[PDB]
């Protein structure tokens, strides 16, 4: 995951649930939190922020 993922295992995908405490899973990157629209400018080789 230094780039977009391409070889991913067989898992199903659901919809976005914004402004609510959920459990997320974005390409194997798990966690728990809320999701809101953001105003950051990702250059087209970056997948995530730190």
């Amino acid at each position: 995951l230094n780039a977009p993922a391409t070889v991913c295992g067989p898992k199903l995908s659901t919809d976005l649930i914004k402004n609510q405490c959920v459990n997320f899973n974005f390409n194997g990157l798990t966690g728990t939190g809320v999701l809101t629209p953001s105003s950051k400018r990702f250059q087209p080789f970056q997948q995530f922020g730190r």
């Binding site: 970056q46 997948q47 922020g49 730190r50």
Partner: peptide, 30 residues
Amino acid sequence: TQHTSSMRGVYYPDEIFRSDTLYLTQDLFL
């Protein structure tokens, strides 16, 4: 001839968005 490379040849270290930070890293730099 020889010249000097004044503050040239810095590149992005990895593929992670960062903003308003100072970041200390070790790599192969000019």
